[PDB]
Every structure is written in C-alpha cells, then in structure tokens.
Amino acid sequence: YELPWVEKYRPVKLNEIVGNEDTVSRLEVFAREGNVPNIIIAGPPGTGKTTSILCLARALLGPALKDAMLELNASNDRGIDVVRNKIKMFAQQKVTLPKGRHKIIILDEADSMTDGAQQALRRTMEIYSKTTRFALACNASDKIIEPIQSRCAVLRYTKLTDAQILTRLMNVIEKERVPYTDDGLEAIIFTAQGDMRQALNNLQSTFSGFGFINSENVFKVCDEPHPLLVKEMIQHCVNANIDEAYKILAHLWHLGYSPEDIIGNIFRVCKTFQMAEYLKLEFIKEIGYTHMKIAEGVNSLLQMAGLLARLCQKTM
Amino acid sequence: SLWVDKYRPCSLGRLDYHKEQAAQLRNLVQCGDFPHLLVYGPSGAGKKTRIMCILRELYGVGVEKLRIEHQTITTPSKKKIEISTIASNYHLEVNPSDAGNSDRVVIQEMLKTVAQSQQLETNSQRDFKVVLLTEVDKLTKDAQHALRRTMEKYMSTCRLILCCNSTSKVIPPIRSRCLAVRVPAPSIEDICHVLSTVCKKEGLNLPSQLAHRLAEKSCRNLRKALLMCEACRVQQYPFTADQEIPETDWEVYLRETANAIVSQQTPQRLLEVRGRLYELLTHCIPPEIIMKGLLSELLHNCDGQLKGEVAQMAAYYEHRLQLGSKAIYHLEAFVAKFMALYKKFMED
C-alpha cells in the first residue's frame, strides 16, 4: 500500500518549491511576517500552486490549521448555497489566532466555479479581510472575473524551466537509487512539457513498468509519437519532399496513432525546430489550420497528406 | 405619412410587377391545403408585400390589425429572455434570429406555445392559421432542425411562411417540404412605372430621365427608390433631369473610403482607412454589406487587368469574415491586400 510519488515527494516547506523564485521568496517573506494579502496563483498544471498555497497555510497557522483553514475543492459541490453558507460562516467564525497569522480559505480550481459563486465570493473577501485571506489556485485567469483578480494579488507561475525539473528529478532518483540513462531522462522532460507532476508520474510509472529509465521504456509506457520521427517529418517537409515524409506518415498511421496526437506532436516538435523564423511562422499557421480541420471532425489520413502538401508548397 | 408604405398594395390584382406569380399564388391559395411557403429573393424586391398580400387573400378583412406582444422564455441556463412578436387575430409573425445562441430555445418553446393554443371559433374562419418567420436564414443548424420538426408535427394545424434572402445557408431538408416562392427584384421599367404611379397620384410631373436615374441608383430596391423620390420632393419640387439625388451617408462614406484607399498606398493611409472602417462598423451595419459596397465603389476605378484578382480576394476575405468572429481583421486584411496589389500594379 505504498503511496505514489506525486504525494510522497510533495514539499513540506516553502523553500523546496522550484517554480517561480521571486514569487516563492516573497511568499516566504509573507510566511515569516504574517500579513499575507489576498493572493491568486495562476499558471499551467504541475508548477506547484497547490503545494505553495498548502505550505504557506501550514507555515502561517501551524497547530491551528484544522480549524483556521478551509480547503474547498472541485470535487465538492460549489453551488450558490455553498458560497452562501460554507464560505460565509467560515469567514464569520472566530479562531484564537496570533497577531499576524490569518484564517485561510484555500479555493483550488477557482476557474471551474460558476458566476454566482464568484458573485458571492467578492463581498466576502472584501469585507472579512481583517480575519480571513483568500489563496486562490487556478489554471486560466480568463474563466475568473476581472474583479477577483483586481482585489487579489495575481501571481503568475511560469511553466517550469527544464533545469529545475532536472534538479528535482535527481533528488527523487537519488532518493530511490533508480538507474537511468541520460537521454531517457531528457525523454521524460519531453513527455513532461512544463508539467512536473506528469514528469514524476511518468518516471514512477516507467520504473515500475520496466527497470532502467531509458528512452525506450518511457516511450513505451507513454506511446506518444516519437520526437525523432516527427522531427524527420518536419525536416522532410522543409526541403520540399512529400514522399519521404509520407513514409513517416504511413509509419505513424499504421502504428495506430490517432490524428489528434499526431498533429499535437507535430506542433510541439515544430515549436523548437531549427529553421527560418518566417518559415516557422507559416508552418505554425498551417499546422494550426490542419488542427482545426482535425478538431472540427475530419480525422482522415488525407488531412495529414494535405498538411504535408501545404508545408511542402510553402517551402517554394 | 410616407408614401413608401401609404400606397402599398393590398389585393393581388393591384400589384405593379410580377403579375404571373401573383396569379399563381392567388390560384394556389384559392383552393385548400395551403402548403408551407419559403419566400426568397433579393432585399427590397417586395417579399413582405407578397406575404401580407397572401395573408389578405387567405383571410377576410382583419389582416392589418397588428400589435406587439412580449413573451419570455427560459434557457437551459437559468436566464429569462424576452422576445418580441408582431401578431394579429388571424396570424403570427416572429423574428426568431434576434436570440443568437438560444435560437433553438425560442424555436422549440414559442411555436410549441402557439401550437398548443387553440383557435377560438375555428369553424368560422378557416382550417388553420399561418406563422411568419421573418428573419430565418441566419438561424443555426439545430434550430432549423427543430424548425422542420415543428413543421412536421403541426402540419395539420400550423403552416409556416419563412422569408429570407440568400438561401445557401438555409438547410436542405426544410427546402424539400416547403413550396419555394421566388420574388425577383423589379426591373428598371417596373420601378419607373411604380414611381410614375406614385407621382401621378400625388399630383407630380416627374420626368422619365430622372426616374431612370432613381432606378439606376436604387440598385433594384423599391423602398430605397421611393425614399429617394420622397427626399427629392422635399429637396426641390420643380424636378429637373440634372438633379442632385440625396444619396445615403454610408454609401458616400464608402465612396470617400474607396478614394482614401486609392489615393495612397502607405501604412498611415491604412491607419486612416482602418479608422473609417471602424466608424462604419460601429453603426451595426453588416460587414458583407460593407464588403459589397467597397467592391462596387472600387471597380469604378481599377484597371481591367486587375478587377479579377480584386474580386477573387473580395470573395476570399468575405468568406473568411463569415468563418471568423471579428470583422475588422478580415476587412483591413482585404484593404491591405488591395493596397499591396495596386502598388505592385503601378510600381511595375
């Protein structure tokens, strides 16, 4: 009954988080000081918004965490009566708290809440701010209204640079003494894409699945289109060759890959490909157009063939 | 009172143009089993004239006693939407396209409501009653699917008359069960005929040449022609052939837009013409109408070896404006491509 590595290697203090260094340092300044403002943390998944908010709440409250901290989440019902009752009478309650430490309402996945939920949120966070402070977590700030981002301090978490993902990955691997190859670990970076929980789960998964951490094992337990094949496809589309890229297309189509994953890996490889900048812009526009062809419901091999033809003709 | 609607015809025998379609519709409504109608044609051709004329021929005297009712509907999301209704004691008339994404909601609920309503003294008047769907072409797909469901389930008690233009966006399987009535735009001679009639009734002596100018500048649109005639009467009662016709502000604004385009081919003139395009777009006029006006006032200037590519790019940017959601990017892309092609044309 061993715990998974996502929850086993969760940080317990605020200096173990490698996401955004200035924001983490200012959060630690507020943890040692006490008067934490209303904060909202935005960014891609896996950057560590939940562990930053949880570690801030723990380092603030301590032993009074079970009564001075309310964690409302997406798996719980968040209707109009919930923001009318649960959040309100948590914000109205009294807790014997120190001079600087304040009550915390951890509102994880605030972008999934309805409009009336945020309508009942706004007055609560403006009025009861002498006692309770809201630490919102979210993925996209567009689904949240502008007034909540106005009354909060917005903390943009970036997608993680691969170096800090490597440092945490050597920390976990040295904690487990799991053998590795280097290129397999770079394959784990490529499978992560700024999602650190995805990197940990894929490493976990892959070792339990197949011993040595080598490109073959991680690319077997994931089964995305291979970076070398799609990179050679885009390279064959660079020098105006429809046929040589079409053997790679038939290789990736007779392997049973769905067209959505094919075009997603095509765009992700085309993001970092070494070619001319205007040519990269035209390629990204055509890959986007074929991706709307896919998303509208035309998932044939001939749409991939037409994508290859358009990338070939745009290179003279 | 304006004469554009004061001298509107009532009976099918006092129509000025399309007499054969008038006789065909009169003999169609003369017998029983009046079918579902889909009336179509260009704007200003006189579709609604035929529709209230058909309503006059189908019923007795009380066909023009109209009033506005307001009906609320509920979306699947908890939100009340108030819709308008032009109604009489013999017929219904709804514009259902005012509700944008909730058009399936009104198309289900409102015609379910008027279908469940019972015709009081139904033996006295006629077998069924008629429902007008004034703007029906820009309804979405499943809204029109619920529309043909509504046409199928109440075929005995409620037939519909759908009025629109450009039926390409109207779905196929509503066109199969609806009798397609096509009203062409009246010709230059028919427009001159009705202008001469509406002037001879009101004690006027309009020359024929000015009637030809009114017809040729009305672009086969009779309401606009009678409004130009009215405005010409207001401007000057002694009518000369060399008369300054009071054109509408948005056409001459498009003419100034077009000559601002062809004057200079620089990004600063592109900024000025983008400001003019924003001023045109802010008046809630459709961008296909702006595109058509830009192409009509643009083809009077360009050389004969460049009209084809200009027309192809006009169709291309109108289509991509229809596929998109914001008009100004596609419009100013069209203007930028025209400036680039024209500066290539005079540069070589």
């Binding site: 032993p63 965490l65 079970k66 009478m89 948590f90 | -």
Partner: protein
C-alpha cells in the same frame, strides 16, 4: 405456480418502504423455503438482504424456483393500493411476464386485483459468509432512527465506537461537534426498549449518514434493532421481521485518513 397468502398486510408495506429509495430494481429468488432477496445500491456501497420464510405465509405453495425481476417504484405505487389490515395474496406463473396481487378486506367485502409487468435482470448472488462479530448491540428502533436523524444535521458522517462504557455516536461538521453516549440498561419493564451490548473487542468505525437514514425507515418492522459491528466487518443492521423472516443490511465503513495534528 406462485400462490402466497399473507394475513398481516402492512408489514410488506413497511418492508417496501425500507427498500423505497435505497434500491430501484431488485430480484426475488423463490424456493420452497420461501422468498429471498439480495440486492445492492446503485453506488454498490450498501447491501440489502430480505428473507421471508415459508411458515410465515398463510397458504404458501411453490413448485419451482423463480428468479423474478422487480422495479420497487412500480410496486411502491402498487403496495400503496394495499390497506393496513388487508390480506395480500401474491400470484405468479412459472414463465410469467405478469405479477398479480390481490388485496382482500378482512370482512371479505372489498376485493382488489393488481398487475405488475416484470423486467429481466442479471442476478449476481453474493454469498454472505457467516462471520463472528466483535460487537453485537440491540437497541430500540425509534432510538436509532432518532440518533441518525439528529446526527445528520451536524455532519454527513458518524463515528460509532463500541467500548466498555457502551456505544458512542459522534459527528463533526461545519456547525460543530456532537457526541451521544448510550450505556447498558439493567432494568426496563419491557424487553423492546433496552440497550443490551455483547462484546469481544472495542471497535470504532465511520459511516455515511445518507445510508443510515435510508436504513432507519424500517422502524415499524421491529421494535428492536441488532447492530453487529467489528473491525474489517460491515455494519450489520438486523431487523427481525416478526416470525416470518429478517431484513439485514450491510454498510461498508468509510476511509479515515490518519493525521498527526
């Protein structure tokens, strides 16, 4: 040929109102020993076993075993046609799509024939093993129903602990805490109001309150309720349905995370 006569008529109504919202389709397994039923909720958390013995019926005869699919909402409406003192005769064929219930007045004046259409269901007979329990507590039915009805206002769960003092029902919700204790009662004038506790080892388990509120609608069936509770064993709620059978429930306990704070 399934003819089964039942003189006391509202006890089947109370049996059904116990199954009324807790389960929507169930299968009746019919043998010469009588009527059997074993079903689960749609969430697969609570198990219901209903056994009606052969000798409890007035005239029971049954040639062959019958697996019979039933929607309890349809005969929830049909058993509301039955009176409180009415005699219920159940009739079915060996290859029936039909079910006949005849409601008879005690003075033989009013006769009622009612028909239910049956549905096919796949039956998974989950054989419940005989397990010895660490704790067996018999308590009043109305007392336990009141216990869950008060504790469902505080929170959504109850912590039931059986120890040497007695049985403790606890709840902890956003309104606050709640702890109701019950001790062994030495002397009651009636045997139906006493709380009597037999023990091997003190236990402590957490249960959802929606399920217990669904369970305790079986209050007028029996005056006494037997809760059999143990570690790694479900919460057995036995109602002895007079002398004609028994209604038994099985609740899996909830997961309690261990926190040092």
């Amino acid at each position: 040929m399934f003819e089964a006569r039942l003189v006391q008529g509202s006890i089947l109504k109370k049996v059904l109102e116990a199954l009324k919202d807790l389960i929507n389709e169930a299968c009746w397994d019919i043998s010469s020993s009588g009527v059997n039923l074993q079903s689960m909720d749609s969430s697969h958390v609570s198990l219901v076993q209903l056994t009606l013995r052969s000798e409890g019926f007035d005239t029971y005869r049954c040639d062959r075993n019958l697996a019979m699919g039933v929607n309890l909402t349809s005969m929830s409406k049909i058993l509301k046609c039955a009176g409180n003192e009415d005699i219920i005769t159940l009739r079915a064929e060996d290859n029936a799509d039909t079910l006949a219930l005849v409601f008879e007045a005690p003075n033989q004046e009013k006769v009622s024939d009612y028909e239910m259409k049956l549905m096919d269901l796949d039956v998974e007979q989950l054989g419940i093993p005989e397990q010895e329990y660490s704790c067996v507590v018999k308590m009043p039915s109305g007392e336990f129903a009141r216990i869950c009805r008060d504790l469902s206002h505080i929170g959504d769960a109850v912590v039931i602990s059986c120890a040497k003092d007695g049985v403790k029902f606890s709840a902890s919700g956003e309104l606050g805490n709640g702890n109701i204790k019950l001790s062994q009662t030495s002397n009651v004038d009636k045997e139906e109001e006493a709380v009597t506790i037999e023990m091997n080892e003190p236990v402590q388990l957490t249960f959802a309150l929606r399920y217990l509120n669904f369970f305790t609608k079986a209050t007028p069936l029996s005056s006494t309720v037997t809760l059999s509770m143990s570690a790694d064993v479900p919460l057995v709620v036995e109602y002895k349905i007079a002398d004609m059978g028994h209604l038994k429930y099985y609740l899996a306990p909830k997961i309690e995370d261990e926190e040092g704070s």
